[PDB]
Design a protein around this nucleic acid. Structure first.
Lengths: 81, 92, 107, 96, 98, 83, 94, 107
DNA sequence: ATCAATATCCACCTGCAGATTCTACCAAAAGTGTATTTGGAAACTGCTCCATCAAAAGGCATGTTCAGCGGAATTCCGCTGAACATGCCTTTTGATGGAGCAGTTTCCAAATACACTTTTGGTAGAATCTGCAGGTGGATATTGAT
DNA sequence: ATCAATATCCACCTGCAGATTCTACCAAAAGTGTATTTGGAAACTGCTCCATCAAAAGGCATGTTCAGCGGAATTCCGCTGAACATGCCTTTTGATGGAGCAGTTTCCAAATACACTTTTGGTAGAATCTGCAGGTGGATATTGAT
């Protein structure tokens, strides 16, 4: 498990900008977006996993992610949370 | 055993749109919505009661909570259904 | 005799007993008066009615009979108040409202 | 041999993607990223498939909203192309 | 006649106001506005001296930060003058407009 | 007809001072009426919540605690008056 | 009349261990009070949710700890956890 | 012989008080014995951290009494405290000195 | 580069608003000893679902060419905001009745607590059903070269 | 404006996964029904502190002038959108073994529940102390004109 941040491929970032209403994208946007996503995921997984452990579990649950998102003000509906 | 508001959501769905269904993922979101508003109102009520050194949450705290949490028109109608329900409940 | 549920006594579809129970177990105060659950069940029932009323319309407008997440998203985002009540909420599989800034259109 | 002008297909895509709701990042690739980041936090962790899905649903909704603000920031610069300076201003004002 | 070039005096004011902490809106006028706005929510109200004070403190801090973000949006536009457009764009991204 | 509407009591010189604190060097004329609008919306949101706290406690006086609590709800926590 | 509790005397005592010759104005003491009530609520509130998620009736130092880990930024958290663990250990050994 | 829990934990903060405040706060049905010790230790530590930095700020201004401005300068010049108090306004604190470079006179 | 007008500093000074030390009375804490109750861990273990290996195939990622067009650098004109001195109308400050925030006291409607009795919302496993995804095709735009 | 190459709208249509539909079990819910405890509304009242009014206080509104900047226009180079060829790795369909979560039961360390004794933090009023904010002075850096 090494360099998966590149799984977020140029095409996929483009589709996301599109849904976002973006018509033209500069070449340096793709590395910037990966950076942004990495921090976002780091913060959510950090909190989610803290919930896992407090409950002495080895399996991260949907609820763990949902409580982590609510802590960060990004309430998500649909998975129990 | 795990409860959800699914059947009540479904009854209500049948009153407003007698011939419309709902996919499970959508019911799931509806269950989320109801639990969300519930915690938001109760919590608002909880603080409300504390700030006033009261140890009881009544229909009155729930009402202020509703006023602080919901936007304009939605509150107006929520407060109505709420007052209405308590009055009707109290006569039986 | 006859034993009528607190919900029917209030004229509600939502469960008054359940809500009352949930109120006590969630530790919000030492005591929970009888009106609290009745009133809360009612506000909760009114809110789900308003959103289903609107989602059901988005379904119909897209020629569908079953409400899916995108229908809940459209109803919420297209409603000024529900949009704010849920201003910091993400509806999974909801997409976004179609919207393209003007300077990006041709001619 | 017929050729659409630059931007015509991009507008076609915006209308297409703003109309549907499927996730846009490939699933397997996204999952490895989750496991990689989580792992570098704590080893021997396992994931319920719905947990990875919830992280993905949140992540994509977060980036899409970010691109709208970015897009607004670029246009504010009298441009039609988003650049890093735009993403950065949107995050700096968001409080990120 | 001695005259300072445009910007020399403003720049002096930025240095001065970033060093101090006193409120910058005159109190009475503020108090009148506060009470007026209040009057639409409930008649015949009274305000503790400290409540008006808290509101001014909160309001000023809020405006001073909105001005910071506005400058940033103006500079983004490659200007050095904040305009309606810039306050508008900042409130929008702050989620205050959306 | 007198000399001032209340929101016009928030004056150019004061608004300027605020901006200065925010590091603004040059200000466009239209900004002034624009700022008053934003201030009005900000106070309506806070005073409304605070007053709802006043009524709930059956009082006729808005207390610092009523503002401090409204501010906290609106995510604008203020230290100094209870908090 | 009545009583109005505040953390002031405790805040003052701590000010001395840190800056024996330094003082603090009234308004500043109010901010510190606000600061202490604020962190308390945040930590307790979080501890409260943790217990509820896990279907527990009790808030133990365990919950206070995880709350701290969730609320405080890195280094702050590191030390905060340290001090907390030390205080309990010492309290017990007595 | 009655000794205070604060002395046993070896803390300046009121352990008996924090306990009382946890119970009344309705945070849970029960409150363990060590939780108030722990929570008071954390409260004390953070309190020292801010006064420690504000004190310094007082010294840098050739002043011996800490005022709001000193607490504001302490918090915003510290990455971590600034984050912890990211959505908090310190009354009478002012802002940090800062002028965007492009607004400076061309030397 | 040369003054000349001002702004900014610094070292020192002193009055007073706000910080401090002091005694006392005391209800509300907070600590202590005893009795009873219970939340939740250790222990055993049924059972869901998570990781994983397998294989087939096409959706979709990657790498390239080519040229249209846009970021951004530069020049520029009038328009508009910064500076400033000029004149007073509004804010600020210190002083005074009374309106309400509270402290106290009373007493009942309403909320626990506990024992039964009764209705019911989940759910384990079914079999039957129906809305729509996705393939097809042809009528209708929408685009771009000329 | 006409025309050719594409994309798009769209109603008809069949396979299938996901939704509605019982049958039966049920313990956890919810409700009915005495008995016990009490929270806080309500009435009365005392003491702040808030609204208001006078006057000593110190900003703000107003018009003139011009320098500098918003934004319109022009220009060019290079980079990013289309289109296309090639093939790989995601995705989809399955089955498998097991780790790890979650149900159930036994039991004790820790927590609740008074009841009693001691102590302590908040309050009120009185008196004395002191850190620093402006106010002065004279030195010097800053700015803008020549």
């Amino acid at each position: 498990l090494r360099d998966n941040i590149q799984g977020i491929t140029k095409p996929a970032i483009r589709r996301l900008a599109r849904r976002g209403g973006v018509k033209r994208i500069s070449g340096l946007i793709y590395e910037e977006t990966r950076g942004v996503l990495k921090v976002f995921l780091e913060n959510v997984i950090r909190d989610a996993v803290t919930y896992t452990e407090h409950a002495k579990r080895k399996t991260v649950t949907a609820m763990d992610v949902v409580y982590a998102l609510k802590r960060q003000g990004r309430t998500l509906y649909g998975f129990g949370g | 055993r795990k409860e959800s508001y699914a059947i009540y959501v479904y009854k209500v769905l049948k009153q407003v749109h007698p011939d419309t269904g709902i996919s499970s993922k959508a019911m799931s979101i509806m269950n989320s919505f109801v639990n969300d508003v519930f915690e938001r109102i109760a919590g608002e009520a909880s603080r409300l009661a504390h700030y006033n050194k009261r140890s009881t949450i009544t229909s009155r705290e729930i009402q202020t909570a509703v006023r602080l949490l919901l936007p304009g028109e939605l509150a107006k109608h929520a407060v109505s259904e709420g007052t209405k329900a308590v009055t009707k409940y109290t006569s039986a | 005799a006859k034993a009528k549920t607190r919900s029917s006594r209030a004229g509600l579809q939502f469960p008054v007993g359940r809500v009352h129970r949930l109120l006590r177990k969630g530790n919000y105060a030492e005591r929970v008066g009888a009106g609290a659950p009745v009133y809360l069940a009612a506000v909760l029932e009114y809110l789900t009615a308003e959103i289903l009323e609107l989602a059901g319309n988005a379904a119909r407008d897209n020629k569908k009979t079953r409400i899916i997440p995108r229908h809940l998203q459209l109803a919420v985002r297209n409603d000024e108040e529900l949009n704010k009540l849920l201003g910091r909420v993400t509806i999974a599989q909801g997409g976004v409202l179609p919207n393209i800034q003007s300077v990006l259109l041709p001619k | 041999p017929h050729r659409y002008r630059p931007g015509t297909v991009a507008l076609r895509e915006i209308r297409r993607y703003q109309k549907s709701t499927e996730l846009l990042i490939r699933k397997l690739p996204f999952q490895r990223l989750v496991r990689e980041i989580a792992q570098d936090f704590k080893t021997d962790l396992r994931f319920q498939s719905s947990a990875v899905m919830a992280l993905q649903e949140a992540s994509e909704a977060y980036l899409v909203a970010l691109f709208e603000d970015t897009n607004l920031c670029a246009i504010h610069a009298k441009a039609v192309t988003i650049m890093p300076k735009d993403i950065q201003l949107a995050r700096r004002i968001r409080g990120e």
